[PDB]
Structure formats: structure tokens, C-alpha cells
Design a protein around this ligand. Structure first.
Ligand code: NAP
Ligand code: SF4
Ligand code: SF4
Ligand code: SF4
Ligand code: ZN
Lengths: 147, 313, 89, 64, 138, 176
């Protein structure tokens, strides 16, 4: 009744505590994604530990432009993730092409390939604005399993 | 028996609380703040990973293998945590008839954890990280036994209980001056968080015994791989350190033994951050080509010494 | 002004008997305060002496290019292109 | 600053401190005199066997 | 040298709050520091400043508990603090309620709103044009 | 100019050979490298935790788009299709109809965040200075529909950032 309701929040507290990102070296957004590891604006053991390998991680951050050559590649990586998974599409390329969009190769918005939970709009995604991409992620995890 | 159960549960916590040090000390080495948000100083984060990786994370490999693969994290913990038993400490759990023989045999048996993870995935991508892990360990098992023999002939027999009593006035670092420097390198034979290390970390290649494993088996691998780092740190603090014995007061020994080990516990993470990987080919050239003739020359030297001046247990 | 559905802002109809609009139901629809140009006629008209006067929003600092308005028609209000500010005499 | 580093060391000064004290302080309840006998070779093993046989009966190691 | 370092930590805990106040700045707040405070802010933000420490740093500042209707003391975001982000924390040197005057317009929102994101009453898309009209009469 | 990377062998005889051999036999210079990060551990980290502390910025900075208004009401945007043409992503859309009687200012005004590379072009191209870029960071949505801006409205709701904009534009007129 009360113990059951608090135990579900305790499991959700583990995702609120720590989430491991994926080092998607996809574009210029990946350089600012490296700035999350940079000391001045840090999530290093604040709630983020870089390790790579899609099998171990909990959150994958799509960091830039995706093309038709990359659409089969990213899709199965998301499938290689453990079932409690979150996708953060960071940048205008990740939201529907920086420019592009009306281009031949670029797939529009990532959502055509892989579903996204948290959007970051910033081209040069400022590390200040990037910090929401992990903090809002933890805030969005509220309730899991009622019955 | 209560002692064994009082040497797994608090020991798994020491491997858990290692994750703090793995990014706190390593963090300040790189001038960055580590654990801070979760606890008072991030102290609630290491215990949070046990709730994170086991209860919610579900993966099993695709093409896989049969019984093997899931057999490997059982082989990871069930051979590396057993290493705590022959340890002399203030008082050992079942003091062995010969001490260090069980320590050397089970350490080589602990290598199989990264070996059976090669056949975890039938695909060839995972076994490259396994084949690299063979040579990065197979060569360093030669000197690991030889440098032991030079220390063991200097002081007592194979029994780990005699190694505490032999250091009453001075440490074994000073007589075994080049041999002590070797045990900062030879200890990193097993896949440990280091600069020398083995095929386990990412950097250049895919992560060995991690790309095939999930989260749950993969989480169980870290509870064994980082456990070996403490094990080598304690083992160096027996063979080379000692300071005092005192059988009457165990309290004076337990505090003094931990400080000596903790200074070495920081030293491996000091190595990890500082230096790049030695390469697959060139690590085979550090030892064998260059260090093996040096260790055998010191082994030749340590045979003559008890004959030159009386030194027999 | 609002009728049955959400309030209209800057002349925009919601839906005729609710057919097209359905997404804006769980989440509340946005609304701009004073968007019907009610604040446009709220500002008092300034008196002039010259035949033509140059308009400015707030000098060179605020975005307003210089426009000359003729105040000689008498019947006409006389307003600039950028502002709804009226000038007499 | 070291005021953040030291709680990471102090938490290790409790958990790693356990296996040393837990092995030693358990000898109070297990044996009469806070000591477990070292075996090594049959000579020291025989002394324990005759001790349990001679009027200790049930106890393995007992004085007088 | 060693005596002054331990005394500096004890004075920091004694100055800000006390016993119950120090725990609130340790469990909820990431870094604990005491200095000068601006004070005056909408909803109930603390806003601290005038600290040396390091380059590009202007004290703890701290977020308010229950700003509009969220009712959270453990959870905090960048939605906190009113129209004052351009000063004290970044860019400008002058303090928003002490020296720097805020410009009046009688059109800007009086009460500051936090970003909903997942919560109801959030952002929405809407049509603009009336389009081509179609008519049919009996 | 030639700087030359080659040292052409520092060792020669007796004293210059033995010290170069001593560092390769044991370590020394690796212990010297070990001491390099020792001092780096001793010095304080330049780290900023976000939920309380904030990072350094500039008086002119671009984030989320918001359109301005005159001190005595009225929409500052005049509807030109100017900023539409400058836009490299073509994220901004504009269609105009006469506002009741007299004034002729906007009907459709959508700025898609699916595109937009953040140039400051539309901030510079605008003659009336309608779109003035504020120091925004917080924007996170569940769907694309919630992300892209509607017909003004949410862009008109930039009043919560217009107080900072008025302070920032004081550094803009007679540039810096
Ligand atoms: N075996 C077959 O394949 C088969 C054969 C012949 C006909 N059919 C017909 O085809 C349909 C197949 O559907 P399915 O079985 O694939 O659906 P399903 O997997 O049972 O999924 C239904 C979803 O609706 C929610 N739901 C249903 N009843 C609910 C309740 N009383 N309270 C709260 N949540 C409720 C559940 O959410 P929660 O999990 O969160 O509660 C669940 O996610 C059936 O309706 C059946 O009539 C199926
Ligand atoms: S959104 Fe901007 S910064 Fe990110 S990948 Fe695209 S062009 Fe580069
Ligand atoms: S924002 Fe400026 S340039 Fe664009 S239509 Fe409006 S007034 Fe013209
Ligand atoms: S900043 Fe550039 S891309 Fe964005 S709306 Fe303005 S002109 Fe278009
Ligand atoms: Zn005007």
C-alpha cells in the first residue's frame, strides 16, 4: 500500500542517481557532448559516467546528423540497449536537420528511426543547456509499475 | 562458520565503495569533481548501482552460447573472492600448508573469466578482445612466479604466516630494491584498471568481457575485476611491507596494515590516469625481451645470498 | 472573446463544433495577453505644431527607422508605419 | 580540496577494517582464550588431538 | 597553517544556519559556502554573491522550495529565479535589486513561470490562417 | 623558419650516456611524470554544479527565439518576409493580413526548432528589432509538436525574458 508505492520510487531513484551515456561521435554536437566530461560543466559522477558499449549503458545521446547510411546502424544499437532505455536527441540535426531537412541523405528528426523522450534544441548545444538533458531526464522518471 | 560470510558482504561493499575512489581520486587527478549530487559527498551513489544494474537491467546475448557465458560471471566472482581466504591478515581463514601456492594458482584460474567470455558470443568481434587478453596475461605469469621465488628464498617458506614475522625491524622493499619496482608492473598481469593493464578497457578496441556481457553479468565482472586490484594491493603489503606484528593486540596491527594498503590502493588509480596503453605487441617486449633477463639475474643473485650469509628458515 | 472553446488571440478560430482541433485538450492552449491591439489605442495621441514630424520609438537605441508623417488632412488620424501613435495639429 | 576526498577514504577505513577485526574478535566465542591453533604439519596437529582427548572431551582446545 | 584550515570549515557551518541549517545545505545543496547575499527576489530565491573562490563564479545562489506550485525541496532546476539571469550570475556586474534598475513596460509578466515539459499546461502548436472558405446553401 | 623536432642524439661520452641510460633502466622520468599530476591533485578544481551555480556568459548571446514589443503596447514586428529570406534553415515562416483597420502586422508566425542553427542573422536583419535573442537554455519537450513554436503566442510569451533583453540591447546599440 505505502511500502509498494515507495519501492517503485526506490527503483526509479537508481535512474535518478546515475545514467551512463553513449559516445555517439556523429557530428559537431559530439564535441559539446565531450564538454560534459570537461570539468567546467560536469556531470562526471554527478549522474553521468562515460564507458561506451551499447549493452552496458542506460541512456543513448544521438549527437548530430543522421543519414540513410546511418539509419540501419543506429536502429539496432537502440535494440542492443537494455529495455529501460532513454534517448536524448541533442541539437537541431537531431531534431530535424540543422540546415538540411530538405536534403537527399539526411533523415529528419531521429523519430523516424528511433523514438525520443527528451529534446535539446541547441545548435552549438551550450553545456549550460545540455545539463537539462540529464537533469530533466531524472525529473521525468516519476512512476513505474502500479499493479 | 561465520568468518567467510563476514568476508564476502563487507568485501563486496569495499568493491562498491571503490567506484567512489575510481572517479574521486581519478577526478582530482584530472582536475574535476567526482561524486557530489547523490549523497553528502556522493556516498549514496555506489550502493545505488546495485539497485540500478541488477534489479532493472535484463539483457542476455543474441546468438550466444549454451551453458557457457553465464558460467563466466560465476567463474569471475567464485575464483577472485575465494582469494581472500588464504590471506594471512592478523589471523587467516584456514591457514594453508603452503600459503602463496594457493594465491598464485587461483589468480591464474581467475584469468578464465575473460577467456570464457570470448566464447560468450559466437561472432568473431568479441574473441579479438579475448585473444588480446591471452598474451597480455600469459607472458607476465612467468615473472610473477620468479620474483616471488627470490623473495620467498630470502624470507621463510611459502606459508603466508611466516611473511609477517620476518619483517620485525625493517621492510623487504630495501633488500629487494629492483624487485619491489617490478611488483608495480607484474601485479597488473590481470585485467585491472591501469595504464599497462590488459584488453578490458575501451580506448582503442571494443571492451573485453563487457561487449558480450549484459549489465547483470557485466556488472558482476566489475565486482570481480576491481576486487583483484585490492587483492594485489594487500599481497604487496604482506611481501614487501610489515612494520610490526604484535600478537597480543590485534587493534594496533589492523589500523597500521590498512594505511599501508590504502596508499597502494591510490597508487594503481594514480597509474591508470597518468599513462596511455602500452600496445599489444610492445607489452610483450617490455617483459620477455627486456625484463625477464633482469628478473632471472636477480633470481640468480637471491640463490647465492642465503649460502653467502646464513638465511634459512 | 470566447465561445465554447478556447479564447481567440490575434484573430484565430479554434474549431467549428470540434472536428479538427483535438490535440489541444490534455495540454492547455497558449494565449497572449493584450493581443487584440487593445493597448494600441490605450496610448494617448500627442499634439504637434509643425506640418510634418519625425517618429521614434525611443531614440536610436530602440528599433525604429525614421518616418515622416503629414498632419494636414484634419479628418485623418495620422499614424506612422511602425507605431499606432496618432498626431494632431 | 581534500574535504571531499577524505570521506572517500574514511568510508574505506570502515569496510576494509572489518575483515581484520571480525576474524580476531570471533576467537572469544569459538575458543577459550581468544586463539585459534596453527596446524601446518602433523606435529602441531597431534597436540590438538590429544588435548581434546584429555579431559576436555567436547572442546578441541582447552587449558588444564 | 593547519589550525587555520580546520577553523575555516567550522566557522562556515556556524555562520550559515546552525545544526539543522547545515544539513539542508549538505543534503539538498551540492556545495556549501557562506558569504554575502543579495536577498530580494521573486517567489523566494536567496541569491548569494561577492565571493572570491575561482574565476567565473558568484557564490551558491540556491533555489527556492515551492516556487509557483511544484512543491519540491529535493528537486530543483534552472526554471528557478525571476528575470534577473542577465546579471549577478552571468554577464553583468551590477546587482538586479541593489544597483541595476529593471526597465518598466506594463506589458511584461509579473509572476515568473516554470517550464512544464511533462506536466499539464505546457507548450502547444496552433493554426493561424482562416484558409479558403467553403459554403453550401439549401 | 624551421624549428626541428630531431635532437640528433643528446648522449656522447661517459656523463651524457649514463644518465640517459639510468632513466631507461629504472624509471625516474616516469616518477617525474607521476609528480606532475600530484600537484594537479593539490590545486582546487574549476568545477560548476548546475542546479545552484551558473557558468560565465556574454551581453550578446543567442538561445530560444522571442519577439519584442513597443513600450506602449503594439507588436514591434512589421511583417516583411525579410528574416524569412536570410534564414539558412528556412525555419521561420511568415504570412500577413491587415489588422482590422490601419495597421498591417502579421497573422502566421512559426519558428521551427526542428531546424534553426542559431545565427543571430534574423536578430541582425530585422530593421525594427523584433526578434532579439535572449540568454535562454531551458527547453525540453516530450514531442516535436511541443518543441516547435506556434503562431507568435509562445514567442509573445517571451515577456518573461524581455526584461533581460532590454538590458542586453543597451550593449547592442552603438555596438560594444
Ligand atoms: N491470443 C491472441 O493473439 C488472440 C486471439 C484471438 C483474438 N484476440 C483478440 O485480439 C486482442 C489482442 O490484444 P492483446 O491481448 O495483444 O492486448 P494486450 O497485450 O493485453 O494489451 C492491452 C493493453 O491495454 C491495457 N489494458 C487492458 N485492459 C486494462 C484494464 N482493465 N485496466 C488497465 N489497463 C488495461 C494494458 O495495460 P497494462 O499492461 O498497463 O495493464 C495493456 O498494455 C484481444 O483483445 C483479443 O480479443 C487475440
Ligand atoms: S545541430 Fe549544429 S552543432 Fe549539432 S551536429 Fe548539427 S550543425 Fe553541428
Ligand atoms: S521579425 Fe523583423 S524582419 Fe522579420 S518580418 Fe518581423 S519586422 Fe520583418
Ligand atoms: S537564428 Fe538563423 S536559423 Fe535560426 S531563425 Fe534566425 S536566421 Fe533562421
Ligand atoms: Zn513610429
Amino acid at each position: 500500500e505505502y511500502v509498494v508505492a515507495k519501492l517503485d520510487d526506490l527503483i526509479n531513484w537508481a535512474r535518478r542517481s546515475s545514467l551512463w551515456p553513449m559516445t555517439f561521435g556523429l557530428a559537431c554536437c559530439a564535441v559539446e557532448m565531450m564538454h560534459m566530461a570537461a570539468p567546467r560543466y560536469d556531470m562526471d559522477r554527478f549522474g553521468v559516467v562515460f564507458r561506451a558499449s551499447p549493452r552496458q549503458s542506460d541512456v543513448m545521446i544521438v549527437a548530430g546528423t543522421l543519414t540513410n547510411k546511418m539509419a540501419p546502424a543506429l536502429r539496432k544499437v537502440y535494440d542492443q540497449m537494455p529495455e529501460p532505455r532513454y534517448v536524448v536527441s541533442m541539437g537541431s540535426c537531431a531534431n530535424g536537420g540543422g540546415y538540411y531537412h530538405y536534403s537527399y541523405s539526411v533523415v529528419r528528426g531521429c523519430d523516424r528511426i528511433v523514438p525520443v523522450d527528451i529534446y535539446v534544441p541547441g545548435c552549438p548545444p551550450t553545456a549550460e543547456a545540455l545539463l537539462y538533458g540529464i537533469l530533466q531526464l531524472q525529473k521525468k522518471i516519476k512512476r513505474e509499475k502500479r499493479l | 562458520m561465520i568468518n567467510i560470510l563476514m568476508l564476502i558482504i563487507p568485501i563486496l561493499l569495499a568493491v562498491a565503495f571503490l567506484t567512489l575512489v575510481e572517479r574521486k581520486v581519478l577526478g582530482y587527478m584530472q582536475l574535476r569533481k567526482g561524486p557530489n549530487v547523490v549523497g553528502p559527498y556522493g556516498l549514496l551513489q555506489p550502493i545505488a548501482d546495485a539497485i540500478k544494474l541488477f534489479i532493472k537491467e535484463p539483457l542476455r546475448p543474441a546468438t550466444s552460447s549454451a551453458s557457457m557465458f553465464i558460467l563466466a560471471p560465476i567463474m569471475a566472482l567464485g575464483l577472485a573472492l575465494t582469494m581472500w581466504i588464504p590471506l594471512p591478515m592478523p589471523y587467516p581463514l584456514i591457514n594453508m600448508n603452503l600459503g602463496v601456492l594457493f594465491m598464485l594458482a587461483m589468480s591464474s584460474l581467475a584469468v578464465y573469466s575473460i577467456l570464457w567470455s570470448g566464447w560468450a558470443s559466437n561472432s568473431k568481434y568479441a574473441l579479438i578482445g579475448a585473444l588480446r587478453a591471452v598474451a597480455q596475461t600469459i607472458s607476465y605469469e612467468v615473472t610473477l612466479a620468479i620474483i616471488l621465488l627470490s623473495v620467498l628464498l630470502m624470507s621463510g617458506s611459502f606459508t603466508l604466516s611466516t611473511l609477517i614475522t620476518t619483517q620485525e625491524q625493517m621492510w623487504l622493499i630495501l633488500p629487494a630494491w629492483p624487485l619491489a619496482m617490478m611488483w608495480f608492473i607484474s601485479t597488473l598481469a590481470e585485467t585491472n584498471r591501469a595504464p599497462f593493464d590488459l584488453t578490458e578497457g575501451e580506448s582503442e578496441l571494443v571492451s573485453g568481457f563487457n561487449v558480450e556481457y549484459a549489465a547483470g553479468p557485466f556488472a558482476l565482472f566489475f565486482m570481480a575485476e576491481y576486487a583483484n586490484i585490492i587483492m594485489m594491493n594487500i599481497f604487496t603489503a604482506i611481501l614487501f611491507l610489515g612494520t610490526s606484528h604484535n600478537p597480543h593486540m590485534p587493534e594496533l596491527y589492523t589500523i597500521n596494515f590498512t594505511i599501508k594498503s590504502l596508499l597502494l590502493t591510490m597508487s594503481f588509480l594514480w597509474i591508470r590516469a597518468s599513462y596511455p596503453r602500452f600496445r599489444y605487441d610492445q607489452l610483450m617486449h617490455l617483459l620477455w625481451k627486456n625484463f625477464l633477463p633482469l628478473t632471472l639475474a636477480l633470481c640468480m643473485w637471491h640463490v647465492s645470498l642465503p649460502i653467502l650469509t646464513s638465511g634459512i628458515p | 472573446x470566447x465561445x465554447x472553446x478556447x479564447x481567440x488571440x490575434x484573430x484565430x478560430x479554434x474549431x467549428x463544433x470540434x472536428x479538427x482541433x483535438x490535440x489541444x485538450x490534455x495540454x492547455x492552449x497558449x494565449x497572449x495577453x493584450x493581443x487584440x491591439x487593445x493597448x494600441x489605442x490605450x496610448x494617448x495621441x500627442x499634439x504637434x505644431x509643425x506640418x510634418x514630424x519625425x517618429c521614434d520609438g525611443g531614440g536610436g537605441a530602440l528599433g525604429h527607422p525614421r518616418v515622416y508623417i503629414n498632419l494636414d488632412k484634419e479628418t485623418k488620424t495620422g499614424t506612422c508605419g511602425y507605431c499606432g501613435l496618432q498626431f494632431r495639429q | 580540496m581534500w574535504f571531499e576526498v577524505l570521506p572517500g577514504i574514511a568510508v574505506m577505513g570502515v569496510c576494509l577494517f572489518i575483515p581484520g577485526m571480525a576474524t580476531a574478535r570471533i576467537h572469544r566465542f569459538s575458543n577459550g582464550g581468544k586463539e585459534k591453533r596453527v596446524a601446518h604439519y602433523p606435529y602441531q596437529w597431534y597436540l590438538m588431538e590429544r588435548d581434546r582427548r584429555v579431559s576436555g572431551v567436547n572442546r578441541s582446545y582447552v587449558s588444564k | 597553517e593547519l589550525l587555520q584550515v580546520l577553523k575555516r570549515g567550522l566557522q562556515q557551518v556556524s555562520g550559515h544556519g546552525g545544526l539543522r541549517g547545515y544539513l539542508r545545505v549538505l543534503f539538498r545543496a551540492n556545495d556549501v559556502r557562506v558569504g554575502t547575499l543579495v536577498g530580494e527576489d521573486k517567489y523566494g530565491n536567496k541569491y548569494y554573491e561577492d565571493n572570491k573562490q575561482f574565476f567565473g563564479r558568484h557564490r551558491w545562489v540556491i533555489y527556492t522550495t515551492e516556487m509557483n506550485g511544484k512543491n519540491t525541496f529535493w528537486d530543483v532546476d534552472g526554471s528557478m529565479v525571476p528575470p534577473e539571469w542577465h546579471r549577478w550570475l552571468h554577464c553583468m556586474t551590477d546587482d538586479p535589486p541593489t544597483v541595476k534598475p529593471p526597465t518598466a513596460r506594463k506589458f511584461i509578466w509579473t509572476n515568473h513561470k516554470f517550464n512544464l515539459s511533462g506536466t499539464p499546461q505546457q507548450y502547444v502548436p496552433y493554426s493561424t490562417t482562416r484558409k479558403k472558405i467553403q459554403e453550401w446553401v439549401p | 623558419t624551421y624549428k626541428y623536432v630531431n635532437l640528433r642524439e643528446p648522449s656522447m661520452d661517459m656523463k651524457s650516456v649514463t644518465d640517459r641510460a639510468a632513466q631507461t633502466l629504472l624509471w625516474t622520468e616516469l616518477i617525474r611524470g607521476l609528480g606532475m599530476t600530484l600537484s594537479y591533485l593539490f590545486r582546487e578544481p574549476a568545477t560548476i554544479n548546475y542546479p545552484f551555480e551558473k557558468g560565465p556568459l556574454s551581453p550578446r548571446f543567442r538561445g530560444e527565439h522571442a519577439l519584442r514589443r513597443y513600450p506602449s503596447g503594439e507588436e514591434r514586428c512589421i511583417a516583411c518576409k525579410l528574416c524569412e529570406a536570410v534564414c539558412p534553415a528556412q525555419a521561420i515562416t511568415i504570412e500577413a493580413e491587415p489588422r482590422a483597420d490601419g495597421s498591417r502586422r502579421t497573422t502566421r508566425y512559426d519558428i521551427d526548432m526542428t531546424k534553426c542553427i542559431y545565427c543571430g542573422f534574423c536578430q541582425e536583419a530585422c530593421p525594427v528589432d523584433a526578434i532579439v535573442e535572449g540568454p535562454n537554455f531551458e527547453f525540453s519537450t516530450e514531442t516535436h509538436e511541443e518543441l516547435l513554436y506556434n503562431k507568435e503566442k509562445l514567442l509573445n510569451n517571451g515577456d518573461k525574458w524581455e526584461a533581460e533583453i532590454a538590458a542586453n540591447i543597451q550593449a547592442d546599440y552603438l555596438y560594444r
